[PDB]
Amino acid sequence: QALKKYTIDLTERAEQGKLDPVIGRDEEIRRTIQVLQRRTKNNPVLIGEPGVGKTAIVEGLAQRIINGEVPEGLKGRRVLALDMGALVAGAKYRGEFEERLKGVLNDLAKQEGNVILFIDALHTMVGAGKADGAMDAGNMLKPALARGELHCVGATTLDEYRQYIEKDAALERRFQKVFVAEPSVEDTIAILRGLKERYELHHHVQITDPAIVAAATLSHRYIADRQLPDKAIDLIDEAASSIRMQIDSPEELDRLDRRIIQLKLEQQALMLDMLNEELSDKERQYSELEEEWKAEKASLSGTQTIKAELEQAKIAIEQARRVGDLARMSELQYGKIPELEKQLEAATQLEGKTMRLLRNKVTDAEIAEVLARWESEREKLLRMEQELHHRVIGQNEAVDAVSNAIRRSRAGLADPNRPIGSFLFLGPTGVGKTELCKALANFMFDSDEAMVRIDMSEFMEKHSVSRLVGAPPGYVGYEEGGYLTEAVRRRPYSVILLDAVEKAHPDVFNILLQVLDDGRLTDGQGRTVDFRNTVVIMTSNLGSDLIQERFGELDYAHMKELVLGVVSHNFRPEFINRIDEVVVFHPLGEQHIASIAQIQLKRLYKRLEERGYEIHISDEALKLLSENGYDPVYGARPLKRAIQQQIENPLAQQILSGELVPGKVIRLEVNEDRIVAVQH
Amino acid sequence: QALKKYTIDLTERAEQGKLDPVIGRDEEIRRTIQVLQRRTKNNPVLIGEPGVGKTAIVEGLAQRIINGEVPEGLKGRRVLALDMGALVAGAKYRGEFEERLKGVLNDLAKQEGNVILFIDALHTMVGAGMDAGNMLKPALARGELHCVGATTLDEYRQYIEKDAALERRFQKVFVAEPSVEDTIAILRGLKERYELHHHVQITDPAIVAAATLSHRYIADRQLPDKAIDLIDEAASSIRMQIDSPEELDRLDRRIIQLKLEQQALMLDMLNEELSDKERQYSELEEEWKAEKASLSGTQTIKAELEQAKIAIEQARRVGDLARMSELQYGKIPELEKQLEAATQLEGKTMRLLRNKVTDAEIAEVLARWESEREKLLRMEQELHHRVIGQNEAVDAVSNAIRRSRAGLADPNRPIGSFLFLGPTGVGKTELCKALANFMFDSDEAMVRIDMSEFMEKHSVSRLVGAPPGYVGYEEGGYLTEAVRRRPYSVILLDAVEKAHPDVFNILLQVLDDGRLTDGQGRTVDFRNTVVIMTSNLGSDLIQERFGELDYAHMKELVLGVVSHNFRPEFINRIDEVVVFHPLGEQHIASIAQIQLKRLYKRLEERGYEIHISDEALKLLSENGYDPVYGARPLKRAIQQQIENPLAQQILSGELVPGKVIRLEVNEDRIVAVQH
């Protein structure tokens, strides 16, 4: 029979128990059966994501059939699965694969809706089955659409259904958008709990349920592409095979074996010795550990065999529930279940006595090992406060203020509908502002390019919200997306700088007030993106004249209050009061200058190590660089070009002169106004 | 034989009764028959949005051919349908689409002027690779083909106005949208087919209610299709609920659990309890079988009723004399009256249950995939569920809403036309939010427009819509996208006095027409929305003179102030300007209390049991309070002075979830305690 050729009977496999027990989704299966026994629009299709038990939904429906958990109209029916390449196994000619296909269709005509086939990827079966002088399955079964011999079910993704299915009329009006939702954490955990024992059978191990829920936690937190229960399945099973590899280890065996073969080499050469006795000791130790290893292996072997016996007893008592034997039910239950459970736990505690070199219970630590091969609040707090001091030098008031703000952010007991970051950073330029943004990215967002640099200096013009945000087109920044909102649509996990807020406009504050209240923000294109996973930072220079002037012999709090009054002169106070905290960046006077110039000197030393050079700087040269490099208006930028000129021009001037020898202490002695390198 | 490979004999299907007895549309069918008996240009096209059943129109034409209602050029023809996607999808190389296409034409000429063709997706046939229209050009032109189109008006103006042979080798037949009552009669014709298929009965008031709610709570799908889907999915849901049961499952798990318990115990009492539960389960089971047998008899007699109707239609075609009167006068009334006896019998016996699908099932299917008027009777109570004070404005807005959904005034004029004054911060925007919320859906499912900004001509060009060939074009005005994506919302106009007076002209076109022409040539209606204009012109006039001064005369005073400000034409078209007086200190304190309510809600979201001194609440209400701005400085000041020291103490490792946390006062501030 052609049904016997290349079809996969799911009811037969579930009757043989070969399919895995699918848990939950009863609303989905119920609404699926709602779509099933309709008069028109009679073929469902599972719109979802690649990997989400959509196949398992079909097989769980077949399991409800074998269980008889279905309505009477679905009783007696047949759930089969048709493979493509099985039909394309031995047929390439002019109409033989298609002859097989039409014979399968004639068997569908033989059953008359008794067989309810499943074939996923309808769009693939429509728009990829290319054949030469021959047809596809799509246009040969498109008759079975309007012939009623096809109550088949589908499965696809949200996009390809819309590509290759919604465009056709008949392929519309035979088919139903059976959407499937993203499942939860805990339902996935429950499916894992149901299918834990199958994996413990296959992989000879035991599974910790705290490790199950923590695996679900870190999978939902970290793993992007994989889905449910796909990443949970893969983490569990990959950790199971990992522990299986650890079963097929040890390591001190290899230590002692290399030792005994090395001393065997030595004693074979020496044929004084003492090494006969040393070899005898190490061989006895190796034999003892070897016999211990074999004993542990025998213990786990008996334990896993009796575990598989327990699961086979569960299978047999389910067969007794389907068939209905009388003494078999109570016999299998009351005899086999508690005695095998208690001696399985007796073997478990026997192992937990003797598991010296080995483990079988996959812990959460094992899951973390897999994931690292693939906690939060206080650790993030303390290491954040530490990492503030490294790149950005000084600004300890701002260190503590931004530490408080991040603390009150990650507390989440403020307004959660506000975005994470709301910051005005006052001070002159140079001063680590961009460096502070990158350090905040470096630890909160744990990377460099989690930021979007946009100044508001370009946005004095009336068309700020248009080019910035998204507009009615005719512009440039539309097919790009935009400057800001559509780059957050690119980067939803980022940090926003807004330099030069003194260069503002009424369509700057208002968009920012919608940010401050909402996070979600109206673009031109009509698709708001939330900002409550991101940090918004502003900077200005308005009272920074006073910051350059009177940071010396004045405090921080009253200076912050006076410059907040200055911002209240400049801005509307209703704008500046939805910010978390407005802080002050002082002019970096001496040691910050020495440190950052020393950083540039050390990376210069690093690149000349790559050349092969060894250079030391004089501190008087450092003093002249501190004088020549810092200005009261700009800071690091004249320091950069002063380092550039007064170092690298005589330096490369003399290196290319062939004057300097690699391997000498190249001391950077001072000239009158320059720096001289010497060879000693 | 590509006809076997690509076409569908619909005449075979309706000849075997597979198809819908399609109802109505007779004028358009007749104009199609007019087109199909021409000498040249023998091809109608069907212009209408998909889901209006143009397919079904051709189907009903085919059923009329089965009836033989046609003139003398169509008797004996065979109507066959065809896709283009069945032809395009096999194009590996050059010349493989087109061998199929010419072999189609060879079969068409082979049947020698006897086959009427159907092709939908005409705009698809435009593009396949020249490709498709040019091979069909001679048979479309020389009368040797009788193609029938089916497409949409947008695709007509996009594709079919390009190739002129694609134009005049077809002909327009306009396809309209079916009405409310005609949908009802259609579903009456479709009722018996559904009741045969899903083995159940249908409430016909639930059918007309399904039609009402299909027009009401559905925007995309249309008729016949959306009501088809509603009735089909509801009938399937009821058929699943009948074809199950739940109490039987509870009793079965109970008896097998007590059976295992009694098997373990072998004091007893459990033989007796098990026998009682088995007896109850057997009673429920026998009731279930009696119900299923009753519905089986009802479905069999219903199917015999339909077979009698098909037989009397075959008698109308063939012409048997006594068979007509016999089948009608005997078989129709007695089977209908004992079908109604089965109806009242299953109304009696379905308990655990119903088969007649009610409109609540329609509500399930609809909201998954009715107290509106009476909520509008208590709409003032709804508005004062959330916003305290300003009772008169609530009353007037409820008056406007009752006039709106009662429909007394001009329906071409918009719903809400309200200028608002007085000082802000008291909850005008909060009133807007709750108004859109309990009125239609949600708080911020609206449109806010910052009319403080717009002061010049280019500003008008912004919010109205830039003219084509200029800067701000392809997504309309600021307003136009905001309303065209939001068919039922509320327009907000803040700081109307800051605008240049030319935008008031746009407002007047709103208030008269309701359709508003943008720069993009399309009118976006406002008639199903509410315009709210707001300002603050007579703020201090009310603040100085709210004390023991009435609503009406102070309204008239500030109305005279607006007359000093605004246009007489503009204040002519106003429905009503409400006062929006400053309420009181205790009511703004109560609004702060509600902010504390949502605050404590968020603390309970964190999971803290936190209480407060009422003196602490008074200090809060006296922190940021100002008459000049309203409660919003009070809102942000209380929010800061709570969220900073409290979460400071929480991150200080002091507060424990599950302790007595009374927000006691400081000398000027508030401390939390741990008890």
Partner: peptide
Amino acid sequence: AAAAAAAAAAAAAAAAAAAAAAAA
């Protein structure tokens, strides 16, 4: 036995457009 016959292999490419504003 037969031979692997040569094909025809029709291919296609596309175009963008460009729309241009005015300043005033």
